[PDB]
Write a protein that binds this ligand. Structure first.
Ligand SMILES: NC(=O)c1ccc[n+]([C@@H]2O[C@H](COP(=O)([O-])OP(=O)(O)OC[C@H]3O[C@@H](n4cnc5c(N)ncnc54)[C@H](OP(=O)(O)O)[C@@H]3O)[C@@H](O)[C@H]2O)c1
Ligand SMILES: Cc1cn([C@H]2C[C@H](O)[C@@H](COP(=O)(O)OP(=O)(O)Oc3ccccc3)O2)c(=O)[nH]c1=O
Ligand SMILES: [Cl-]
Ligand SMILES: [Cl-]
Ligand code: NA
Length: 325
């Protein structure tokens, strides 16, 4: 039997990425979709199947729901994750899992006491391209790693977007900066420590719209992370090594059909490698479903989500905050 999934929140990321993966995945059946507006739930179920439900509590009461996907605004994640876990449902939560490390530890403790999986949906971690890059780096293609940069920046979203509301979507650090912060943990490891950052806050809407952070490992391998929603589109990372450098674009959100291109440069020679395409959305939802079906809930996933929450908090608290104009 596939796991029966209920979705709370008819989100753009659900319509575009998550629901098409759930629909197509044999291991998951979309049984219910809830919205603050019934008419919106219905539009989603007409597209993806399942019963439309008005409000989120009604969905969590359902006996035909095994697991809930939570694509709510970041600031509202904790309330509804807590409620879903207490309802007995495993939970696939969108990134950032929540807003701070203590909150994250509480949500994991609630899940733990109930034997339930709580997974942070960093779907990009499921794309093979990163392990292919790390394997090249481990092979010595650019020598010892000296530093790392990653960037995820996007042009401004329509007014009224959740990301402009500090107590709903939570701004550019929580919603977008988490990507390059997470790539830095993925590649440089578990001992990253905050050094300095700047966050630009737009006075008018009182929300963070961009930033830059410097982190370091205890050996002095640095990570320069840039993010924002006042920018042209950038979505990349780059390693600087003792004998070369490696970089790639479309790192966090490659299309399912897009073939990554790894660029390497060293003295007097540069190369580009085309890698296979992969559907990271589909892979992330299949990994969640398999963990729920098997009961094998990888320890690394929660430990990594907790370390990630800590670094985000450290950037939020350590940053210099600049309000403009
Ligand atoms: N993993 C990824 O790559 C990725 C990509 C994009 C976004 N996301 C994440 O997905 C989550 C949602 O982002 P999104 O871009 O899809 O946003 P979105 O379209 O605003 O969807 C959020 C959904 O939350 C519900 N909601 C409940 N209270 C709300 C409130 N006060 N204001 C607005 N919506 C409220 C709404 O559903 P109802 O109206 O139907 O109740 C809304 O459709 C965030 O945590 C975001 O960071 C992840
Ligand atoms: C390709 C592309 C996108 N965007 C805009 C369109 C969009 O507003 C934003 C990101 O598009 P994407 O990287 O596809 O990521 P998701 O929408 O899956 O998830 C996120 C949504 C918001 C923040 C981060 C991820 O960039 C551009 O402006 N130019 C581009 O070439
Ligand atoms: Cl993702
Ligand atoms: Cl390219
Ligand atoms: Na600060």
């Amino acid at each position: 039997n596939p796991i029966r999934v209920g979705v709370i929140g008819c989100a753009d990321i659900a319509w575009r990425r998550a629901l098409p993966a759930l629909e197509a995945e044999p291991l998951t059946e979309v049984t219910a979709i809830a919205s603050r507006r019934w008419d919106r739930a219905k539009r989603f179920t007409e597209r993806f199947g399942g019963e439309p439900v008005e409000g989120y509590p009604a969905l969590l009461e359902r006996d035909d729901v095994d697991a809930v996907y939570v694509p709510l605004p970041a600031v509202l994640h904790a309330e509804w994750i807590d409620r879903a876990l207490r309802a007995g449902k495993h939970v696939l939560a969108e990134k950032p899992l929540t807003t701070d490390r203590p909150q994250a530890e509480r949500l994991f403790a609630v899940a733990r006491e109930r034997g339930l999986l709580l997974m942070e949906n960093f779907m990009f971690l499921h794309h093979p391209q990163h392990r292919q890059v790390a394997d090249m780096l481990d092979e010595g293609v650019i020598g010892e790693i000296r530093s790392f940069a990653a960037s995820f920046t996007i042009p401004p979203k329509p007014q009224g977007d959740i990301r402009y509301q500090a107590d709903v979507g939570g701004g550019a650090l929580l919603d977008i900066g988490v990507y390059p912060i997470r790539a830095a943990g993925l590649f440089l490891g578990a001992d990253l420590e905050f050094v300095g950052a700047v966050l630009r806050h737009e006075r008018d809407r009182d929300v963070v719209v961009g930033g830059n952070a410097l982190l370091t490992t205890r050996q002095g391998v640095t990570a320069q992370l840039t993010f924002g929603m006042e920018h042209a589109y950038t979505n990349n990372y780059e390693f600087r090594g003792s004998t070369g450098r490696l970089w790639m674009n479309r790192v966090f959100t490659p299309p399912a059909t897009y073939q990554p291109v790894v660029h390497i440069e060293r003295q007097d020679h540069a190369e580009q490698f085309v890698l296979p395409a992969h559907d990271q959305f589909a892979k992330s939802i299949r990994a969640f479903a398999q963990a729920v079906l098997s009961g094998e809930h990888p320890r690394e996933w929660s430990e990594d989500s907790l370390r990630q929450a800590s670094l985000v908090d450290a950037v939020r608290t350590g940053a210099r905050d600049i309000y403009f104009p």
